[PDB]
Amino acid sequence: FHVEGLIAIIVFYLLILLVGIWAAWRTKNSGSAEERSEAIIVGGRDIGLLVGGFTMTATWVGGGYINGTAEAVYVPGYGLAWAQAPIGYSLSLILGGLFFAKPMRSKGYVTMLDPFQQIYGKRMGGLLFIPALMGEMFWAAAIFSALGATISVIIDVDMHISVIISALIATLYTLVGGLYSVAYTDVVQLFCIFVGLWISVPFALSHPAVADIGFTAVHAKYQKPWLGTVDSSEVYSWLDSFLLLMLGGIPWQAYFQRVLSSSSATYAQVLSFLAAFGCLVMAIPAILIGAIGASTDWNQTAYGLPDPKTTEEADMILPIVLQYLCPVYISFFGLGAVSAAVMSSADSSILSASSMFARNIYQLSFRQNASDKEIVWVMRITVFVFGASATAMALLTKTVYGLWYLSSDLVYIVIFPQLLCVLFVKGTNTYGAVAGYVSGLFLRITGGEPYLYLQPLIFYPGYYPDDNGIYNQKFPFKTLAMVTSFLTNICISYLAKYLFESGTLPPKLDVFDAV
Amino acid sequence: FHVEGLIAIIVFYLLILLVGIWAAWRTKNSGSAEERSEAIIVGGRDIGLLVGGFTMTATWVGGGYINGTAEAVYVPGYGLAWAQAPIGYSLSLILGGLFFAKPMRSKGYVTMLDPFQQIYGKRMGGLLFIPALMGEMFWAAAIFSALGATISVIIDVDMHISVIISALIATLYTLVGGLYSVAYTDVVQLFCIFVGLWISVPFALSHPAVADIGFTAVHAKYQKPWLGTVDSSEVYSWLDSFLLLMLGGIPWQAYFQRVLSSSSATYAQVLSFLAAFGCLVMAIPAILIGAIGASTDWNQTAYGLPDPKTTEEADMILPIVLQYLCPVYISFFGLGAVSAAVMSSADSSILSASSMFARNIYQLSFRQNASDKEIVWVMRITVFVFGASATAMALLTKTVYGLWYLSSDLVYIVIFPQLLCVLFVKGTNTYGAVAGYVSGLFLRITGGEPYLYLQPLIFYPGYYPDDNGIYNQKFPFKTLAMVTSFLTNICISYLAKYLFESGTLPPKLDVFDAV
Ligand SMILES: CCCCCCCCCCC(CCCCCCCCCC)(CO[C@@H]1O[C@H](CO)[C@@H](O[C@H]2O[C@H](CO)[C@@H](O)[C@H](O)[C@H]2O)[C@H](O)[C@H]1O)CO[C@@H]1O[C@H](CO)[C@@H](O[C@H]2O[C@H](CO)[C@@H](O)[C@H](O)[C@H]2O)[C@H](O)[C@H]1O
Ligand SMILES: CCCCCCCCCCC(CCCCCCCCCC)(CO[C@@H]1O[C@H](CO)[C@@H](O[C@H]2O[C@H](CO)[C@@H](O)[C@H](O)[C@H]2O)[C@H](O)[C@H]1O)CO[C@@H]1O[C@H](CO)[C@@H](O[C@H]2O[C@H](CO)[C@@H](O)[C@H](O)[C@H]2O)[C@H](O)[C@H]1O
Ligand SMILES: *[C@@H]1O[C@H](CO)[C@@H](O[C@@H]2O[C@H](CO)[C@@H](O[C@@H]3O[C@H](CO)[C@@H](O)[C@H](O)[C@@H]3O)[C@H](O)[C@H]2NC(C)=O)[C@H](O)[C@H]1NC(C)=O
Ligand SMILES: *[C@@H]1O[C@H](CO)[C@@H](O[C@@H]2O[C@H](CO)[C@@H](O[C@@H]3O[C@H](CO)[C@@H](O)[C@H](O)[C@@H]3O)[C@H](O)[C@H]2NC(C)=O)[C@H](O)[C@H]1NC(C)=O
Ligand SMILES: CC(C)CCC[C@@H](C)[C@H]1CC[C@H]2[C@@H]3CC=C4C[C@@H](OC(=O)CCC(=O)O)CC[C@]4(C)[C@H]3CC[C@]12C
Ligand SMILES: CC(C)CCC[C@@H](C)[C@H]1CC[C@H]2[C@@H]3CC=C4C[C@@H](OC(=O)CCC(=O)O)CC[C@]4(C)[C@H]3CC[C@]12C
Ligand SMILES: C[N+]1(C)CCO[C@@](O)(c2ccc(-c3ccc([C@@]4(O)C[N+](C)(C)CCO4)cc3)cc2)C1
Ligand SMILES: C[N+]1(C)CCO[C@@](O)(c2ccc(-c3ccc([C@@]4(O)C[N+](C)(C)CCO4)cc3)cc2)C1
């Protein structure tokens, strides 16, 4: 059982819990006494540059970002060219810092939905809250499932117990404390994941069993080369994936909660670049470990004859190299690193979802008149209930990954064009917003779901048949949908504004405010 | 001749020159119009945290810090344990940030010597200026010589031409601009050295000729192991070297010019830690390259049979691996990295020396009444003349390295105890300062000079005979001298204060101000 590993894990958990408790103690004079909700939600709009950069780049890298890259590098047929997580995340952060998040700090805003609830109606603000909430919960569930799998592989510990303990730790953090506590925990977690991941590269590379990883990047050894060039017949799919990972990670409440906490705007502008650099630095060891796993031969290690690819467990290729190609005291460090990244991403996501709901649904839509104590108690109970819901989804269900992918898709397709319209273009009244949202949502769900083999419905050129024969798509409908939403929103909003201006349609049926 | 390399070098030089010119253009409204000297010297006391950290950690790493570490790792009999540059620099920065540089920013100060000229007399302020000036010039000369050797090895270019061009570039930077221009150049130079050094590690490691670098760390292959454990009979020397590199890099005008430019004190406090982290990150590839050079066999590479150790050119072990174990387009990148680090350290040192002199010797000691234009012209001519002097010393002399070591020693032994006394303890009048400085200086020069085989004079236990038979020392006299200076300064200052207080010695002979 290696009781030393369990003791180290529990004392590390207690140490980060003590850090969170100290942060909660420190967070007692943030602002005056009648803005407790706003204070706990946005940290009092006062953090340092380094602390913000560290907490944000710890938020983005959360274990799934490591495992997906490692698996994509390792699994034959994907290669390195199909592991678009590093470049996608880095360029998404760079684009966000360049274009967005400067106006967000320019105005006095609390969450992502505040501009939306200000421009459109309260109904529209409550309606756009569903996709982002679903995406954040699904992401947290997937991250928790990945952590459970890693724990179960590393030590003979039940997945349920590990995920329950880690999630309870996350709720005990983000319930007793808010943004301050979560950022102070993420600062330590960043260093934990760095010292864990970057220290296991020389250990694995110098293994006698492993071959020359440079020879396999252009030649074949035990399998197809791990570089993985993309064929010309699938360039559209690669561009679609790049666009999704480039423009679908920017309209996330985790990003906007951290930008709307710096004392100024240039602080957040350079925070984005620091986060991108940290994301690249974190992605490098994952790529290296994936390459090591791809360019090594089993039947000489403690694993045995059947490779991970045949046994269909390549989703956890990282904690398999970290276990069978490194000593025990390096394996425990890497497990701690993965757990710390998972905890950081999970707590950040759950706090962002709670911050979105317990304000933009409760005090601006349902109870416009409520005491600060009531709202803070709603805050504290909402963090717990949403964490419990994410835990139940992660533990009692097995289709979490595909649902998470679909939820991220939906978040991108819905929020990003609407965020672009509300932040950059003028006009963009709710009359066109409803039509754009409906069109994008229905076009995406009719675009085809190939993971859960649910329904292809509308056929697009390419007609790719999977194992079940369900027709898969090739056209970039995942981004055609976003562009369709953008143009239809602009056109319909301007048409409504022009028709109202000319008086051709009677103002009697003006349901919303566009006169 | 590889004209592509020369073209790349000259266009890189022109690019950084354009960056410096743009910085000089930007630095035109720093403060009001009657503080031109103070503005050009301390950057207007307004820089960002990231810019300050980057410029400072680029200042510390300057090519010599790389070559010395690589040579110490490579040369047999030294090993890794005797390469105390990384830990020494990092802990010096950490100690500085913790203890010093908070009071420096607390008071309104311009250079290191301002507290000294304020507490002691103008004569004492002018007297302590000599050692730091000599140390900075000697360091710049050594760095320039190292760059010349690297250029001469990489390309068939005369050393004189390369050092002249690089030094002229440095003067053209720090003459047209001050702290702002030097920091804006160092920011780009940091990224240049990073992308140069850290990109040549996988290229050299994957060489067919090189052996397993992990096997040679505890075993012997072609030579003694490159780890290099320190014998128990030389522990005192190791502790002496560690103390020198730990407490002798803190009282340097390069450090205090960069701390006395941030808008606050916590900015500099965390700037020190950022600099230490950057220094460690820069030191890692140097250690790796030294290990690669130590654990590789010639007679299979383009070099030939005689190893660098036998030919006695191990001082440039880094640009030898970078040349014969990497392709041409990686060798040029590494050469650019080394040149950028050299330029950063040289320009920082020359600007610090000019800032010290042209203020604390000229406007507070000689011409108390002078126009701002006169002082700025003195600034601009002093930068050029000191750069030319450093260039002449680096080019026309061959004993630069040992003189630089002795100058750093002297700077440590003299400044650091006096800085400690003036910054921390009370009393410490000039009456004891004179005695402490004289005692430390004479004790150090009588402690023995083993490099230039000049004079051992006073014998200390150990009686180590070198090739010439000159007795070398073992006792930690290099730190005994500093502790002797500290205690004698404290004791003599307090004795003078007590004697003045009691009236036992008549106040007629009170030369200085201690009544
Ligand atoms: C500046 C930055 C880089 C610095 C380091 C550069 C060099 C890296 C060296 C890597 C290194 C140390 C680990 C990393 C330390 C440094 C971490 C630094 C982190 C921070 C940067 C890898 O050695 C490690 O341990 C095992 C070897 O010991 C090896 O395999 C083992 O464990 C697997 C898992 O449990 C598992 O499959 C199985 O048990 C093994 O297969 C592991 O895969 C490996 O991780 C080198 O160790 C060298 O490897 C030698 C065999 O080549 C090894 O045996 C040699 O000596 C023996 C007598 O001592 C002698 O009897 C042997 O005959 C001789 O061969 C020695 O240990 C050592 O000489
Ligand atoms: C992080 C940013 C930087 C990344 C840089 C990545 C590229 C680095 C260079 C690529 C590289 C490292 C791979 C590293 C993997 C991990 C990378 C990612 C890590 C981070 C995620 C692998 O290159 C592989 O090496 C093979 C040999 O092992 C070689 O030949 C194989 O395929 C052939 C058909 O193509 C086939 O005919 C052949 O039979 C195969 O054997 C191929 O080039 C290739 O397969 C090293 O190769 C570089 O070039 C030379 C060999 O080409 C190598 O030696 C040569 O040049 C010396 C100097 O001039 C000089 O002595 C000699 O001319 C010669 O000895 C260099 O020393 C090395 O530097
Ligand atoms: C992959 O794993 C297989 C496991 O079967 C390795 O097979 C090895 O084959 C050699 C050659 O026959 C065996 O050596 C001799 O085997 C006999 C039994 O037939 C034994 O009595 C002798 O004492 C001697 O060991 C070897 O045992 C066998 N390995 C094992 C574990 O039994 C094979 O080499 C591996 N590598 C590949 C296929 O690349
Ligand atoms: C270190 O360098 C020496 C260079 O002399 C290497 O010596 C090599 O020795 C082999 C074995 O004799 C030579 O192979 C044969 O040499 C004869 C000449 O005696 C030649 O006519 C044959 O065609 C064949 O090449 C080899 O040439 C020779 N190397 C050279 C460059 O001449 C030695 O192997 C190297 N490595 C060590 C000592 O570990
Ligand atoms: C996260 C990714 C998208 C960006 C950061 C990593 C890349 C900059 C690295 C990762 C792996 C590297 C590759 C690994 C191996 C090789 C083979 C190497 O050798 C050959 O192709 C054979 C000919 C030769 O040796 O020159 C050339 C560099 C290349 C393509 C490397 C180019 C740079 C790559 C793509
Ligand atoms: C700049 C320095 C002072 C600090 C940063 C680098 C060190 C943390 C690294 C550099 C080289 C490393 C060493 C390189 C090789 C080895 C051999 C390695 O294997 C053995 O000693 C044999 C037994 C075994 O394999 O466990 C153990 C780790 C060790 C000492 C490493 C320990 C960590 C070291 C000292
Ligand atoms: C080939 N697979 C293994 C199957 C699915 O396609 C993939 O290429 C893929 C595509 C997108 C993702 C993805 C993951 C997370 C997110 C996310 O919502 C998560 N964050 C919010 C954490 C940051 C980025 O946005 C978006 C896209 C993951 C895997 C990976
Ligand atoms: C064994 N050798 C090769 C011979 C001399 O002893 C060494 O260990 C050694 C000792 C100290 C140094 C040293 C170099 C620079 C400095 C410096 O003045 C330079 N900076 C101001 C740049 C930072 C540190 O302080 C101090 C000590 C260099 C080499 C190296």
PDB file of C-alpha atoms in Angstrom, chain B residues 168-284:
ATOM      1  CA  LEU B 168      31.135  50.768 -28.858  1.00  0.00           C
ATOM      2  CA  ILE B 169      27.568  49.444 -28.988  1.00  0.00           C
ATOM      3  CA  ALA B 170      27.407  49.458 -25.179  1.00  0.00           C
ATOM      4  CA  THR B 171      28.671  53.046 -24.966  1.00  0.00           C
ATOM      5  CA  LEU B 172      26.304  54.165 -27.733  1.00  0.00           C
ATOM      6  CA  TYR B 173      23.515  52.720 -25.588  1.00  0.00           C
ATOM      7  CA  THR B 174      24.433  54.058 -22.146  1.00  0.00           C
ATOM      8  CA  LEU B 175      25.591  57.439 -23.501  1.00  0.00           C
ATOM      9  CA  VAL B 176      22.460  58.383 -25.436  1.00  0.00           C
ATOM     10  CA  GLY B 177      20.279  56.843 -22.715  1.00  0.00           C
ATOM     11  CA  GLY B 178      20.385  56.115 -19.019  1.00  0.00           C
ATOM     12  CA  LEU B 179      18.639  53.606 -16.785  1.00  0.00           C
ATOM     13  CA  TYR B 180      15.531  53.486 -18.956  1.00  0.00           C
ATOM     14  CA  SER B 181      17.489  52.733 -22.126  1.00  0.00           C
ATOM     15  CA  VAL B 182      19.723  50.180 -20.407  1.00  0.00           C
ATOM     16  CA  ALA B 183      16.728  48.367 -18.892  1.00  0.00           C
ATOM     17  CA  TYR B 184      14.811  48.351 -22.176  1.00  0.00           C
ATOM     18  CA  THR B 185      17.849  46.837 -23.895  1.00  0.00           C
ATOM     19  CA  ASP B 186      18.346  44.286 -21.105  1.00  0.00           C
ATOM     20  CA  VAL B 187      14.715  43.160 -21.395  1.00  0.00           C
ATOM     21  CA  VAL B 188      15.276  42.042 -24.990  1.00  0.00           C
ATOM     22  CA  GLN B 189      18.731  40.686 -24.153  1.00  0.00           C
ATOM     23  CA  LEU B 190      17.263  38.415 -21.464  1.00  0.00           C
ATOM     24  CA  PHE B 191      14.938  36.733 -23.952  1.00  0.00           C
ATOM     25  CA  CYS B 192      17.810  36.506 -26.435  1.00  0.00           C
ATOM     26  CA  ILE B 193      20.060  34.656 -23.987  1.00  0.00           C
ATOM     27  CA  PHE B 194      17.182  32.419 -22.862  1.00  0.00           C
ATOM     28  CA  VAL B 195      16.166  31.379 -26.378  1.00  0.00           C
ATOM     29  CA  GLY B 196      19.826  30.863 -27.229  1.00  0.00           C
ATOM     30  CA  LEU B 197      21.012  28.848 -24.240  1.00  0.00           C
ATOM     31  CA  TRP B 198      17.948  26.722 -23.510  1.00  0.00           C
ATOM     32  CA  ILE B 199      17.545  25.686 -27.171  1.00  0.00           C
ATOM     33  CA  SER B 200      21.039  24.163 -27.508  1.00  0.00           C
ATOM     34  CA  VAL B 201      20.599  21.553 -24.747  1.00  0.00           C
ATOM     35  CA  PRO B 202      18.581  18.940 -26.714  1.00  0.00           C
ATOM     36  CA  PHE B 203      20.833  19.502 -29.730  1.00  0.00           C
ATOM     37  CA  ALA B 204      23.992  18.681 -27.767  1.00  0.00           C
ATOM     38  CA  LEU B 205      22.492  15.911 -25.621  1.00  0.00           C
ATOM     39  CA  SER B 206      21.282  13.899 -28.633  1.00  0.00           C
ATOM     40  CA  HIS B 207      24.740  13.848 -30.221  1.00  0.00           C
ATOM     41  CA  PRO B 208      25.875  10.354 -31.291  1.00  0.00           C
ATOM     42  CA  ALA B 209      29.379  10.989 -29.939  1.00  0.00           C
ATOM     43  CA  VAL B 210      28.276  11.918 -26.411  1.00  0.00           C
ATOM     44  CA  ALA B 211      27.860   9.201 -23.787  1.00  0.00           C
ATOM     45  CA  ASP B 212      25.288   8.844 -20.999  1.00  0.00           C
ATOM     46  CA  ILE B 213      25.760  11.929 -18.829  1.00  0.00           C
ATOM     47  CA  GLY B 214      24.070  10.171 -15.909  1.00  0.00           C
ATOM     48  CA  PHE B 215      26.599   7.339 -15.838  1.00  0.00           C
ATOM     49  CA  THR B 216      29.545   9.738 -15.480  1.00  0.00           C
ATOM     50  CA  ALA B 217      28.063  11.607 -12.502  1.00  0.00           C
ATOM     51  CA  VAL B 218      29.063   8.792 -10.125  1.00  0.00           C
ATOM     52  CA  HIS B 219      31.435   6.763 -12.330  1.00  0.00           C
ATOM     53  CA  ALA B 220      34.483   7.653 -14.423  1.00  0.00           C
ATOM     54  CA  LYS B 221      34.573   7.766 -18.228  1.00  0.00           C
ATOM     55  CA  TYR B 222      37.516   9.327 -20.122  1.00  0.00           C
ATOM     56  CA  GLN B 223      38.239  11.287 -16.922  1.00  0.00           C
ATOM     57  CA  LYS B 224      37.279  11.804 -13.285  1.00  0.00           C
ATOM     58  CA  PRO B 225      33.524  12.062 -12.605  1.00  0.00           C
ATOM     59  CA  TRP B 226      32.047  15.485 -13.268  1.00  0.00           C
ATOM     60  CA  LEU B 227      30.182  15.609  -9.943  1.00  0.00           C
ATOM     61  CA  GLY B 228      33.406  16.387  -8.087  1.00  0.00           C
ATOM     62  CA  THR B 229      32.941  15.793  -4.370  1.00  0.00           C
ATOM     63  CA  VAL B 230      34.881  18.174  -2.128  1.00  0.00           C
ATOM     64  CA  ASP B 231      37.499  16.621   0.139  1.00  0.00           C
ATOM     65  CA  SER B 232      37.304  17.132   3.893  1.00  0.00           C
ATOM     66  CA  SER B 233      40.714  18.850   3.883  1.00  0.00           C
ATOM     67  CA  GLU B 234      39.368  21.739   1.758  1.00  0.00           C
ATOM     68  CA  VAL B 235      35.999  22.419   3.421  1.00  0.00           C
ATOM     69  CA  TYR B 236      37.241  25.746   4.799  1.00  0.00           C
ATOM     70  CA  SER B 237      38.108  26.947   1.289  1.00  0.00           C
ATOM     71  CA  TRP B 238      34.664  25.922   0.028  1.00  0.00           C
ATOM     72  CA  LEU B 239      32.985  27.815   2.868  1.00  0.00           C
ATOM     73  CA  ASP B 240      35.185  30.839   2.135  1.00  0.00           C
ATOM     74  CA  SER B 241      34.183  30.794  -1.535  1.00  0.00           C
ATOM     75  CA  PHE B 242      30.511  30.391  -0.630  1.00  0.00           C
ATOM     76  CA  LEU B 243      30.658  33.307   1.814  1.00  0.00           C
ATOM     77  CA  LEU B 244      32.408  35.476  -0.780  1.00  0.00           C
ATOM     78  CA  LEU B 245      29.861  34.705  -3.495  1.00  0.00           C
ATOM     79  CA  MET B 246      27.017  35.078  -0.967  1.00  0.00           C
ATOM     80  CA  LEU B 247      27.863  38.400   0.706  1.00  0.00           C
ATOM     81  CA  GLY B 248      30.112  40.032  -1.895  1.00  0.00           C
ATOM     82  CA  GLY B 249      27.577  40.369  -4.686  1.00  0.00           C
ATOM     83  CA  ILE B 250      25.072  42.281  -2.560  1.00  0.00           C
ATOM     84  CA  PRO B 251      27.004  45.593  -2.037  1.00  0.00           C
ATOM     85  CA  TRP B 252      27.309  46.264  -5.775  1.00  0.00           C
ATOM     86  CA  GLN B 253      26.104  49.474  -7.406  1.00  0.00           C
ATOM     87  CA  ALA B 254      24.407  47.431 -10.133  1.00  0.00           C
ATOM     88  CA  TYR B 255      22.100  45.973  -7.461  1.00  0.00           C
ATOM     89  CA  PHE B 256      21.336  49.302  -5.810  1.00  0.00           C
ATOM     90  CA  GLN B 257      20.733  51.205  -9.052  1.00  0.00           C
ATOM     91  CA  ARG B 258      18.021  48.690  -9.959  1.00  0.00           C
ATOM     92  CA  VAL B 259      16.458  48.581  -6.483  1.00  0.00           C
ATOM     93  CA  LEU B 260      16.401  52.393  -6.308  1.00  0.00           C
ATOM     94  CA  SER B 261      14.155  52.635  -9.358  1.00  0.00           C
ATOM     95  CA  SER B 262      10.919  50.807  -8.461  1.00  0.00           C
ATOM     96  CA  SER B 263       7.864  52.848  -7.520  1.00  0.00           C
ATOM     97  CA  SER B 264       7.700  51.156  -4.095  1.00  0.00           C
ATOM     98  CA  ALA B 265       9.717  48.895  -1.789  1.00  0.00           C
ATOM     99  CA  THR B 266       7.786  45.617  -2.048  1.00  0.00           C
ATOM    100  CA  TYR B 267       8.338  45.848  -5.809  1.00  0.00           C
ATOM    101  CA  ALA B 268      12.100  45.642  -5.297  1.00  0.00           C
ATOM    102  CA  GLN B 269      11.680  43.044  -2.546  1.00  0.00           C
ATOM    103  CA  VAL B 270       9.971  40.661  -4.976  1.00  0.00           C
ATOM    104  CA  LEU B 271      12.258  41.829  -7.801  1.00  0.00           C
ATOM    105  CA  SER B 272      15.161  40.286  -5.902  1.00  0.00           C
ATOM    106  CA  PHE B 273      13.388  36.914  -5.707  1.00  0.00           C
ATOM    107  CA  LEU B 274      12.463  37.061  -9.393  1.00  0.00           C
ATOM    108  CA  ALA B 275      16.120  37.768 -10.177  1.00  0.00           C
ATOM    109  CA  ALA B 276      17.236  34.791  -8.083  1.00  0.00           C
ATOM    110  CA  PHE B 277      14.793  32.494  -9.883  1.00  0.00           C
ATOM    111  CA  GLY B 278      15.967  33.794 -13.254  1.00  0.00           C
ATOM    112  CA  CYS B 279      19.589  33.252 -12.236  1.00  0.00           C
ATOM    113  CA  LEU B 280      18.875  29.623 -11.343  1.00  0.00           C
ATOM    114  CA  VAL B 281      16.976  29.122 -14.613  1.00  0.00           C
ATOM    115  CA  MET B 282      19.944  30.553 -16.523  1.00  0.00           C
ATOM    116  CA  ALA B 283      22.446  28.454 -14.564  1.00  0.00           C
ATOM    117  CA  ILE B 284      20.724  25.126 -15.298  1.00  0.00           C
TER     118      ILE B 284
END
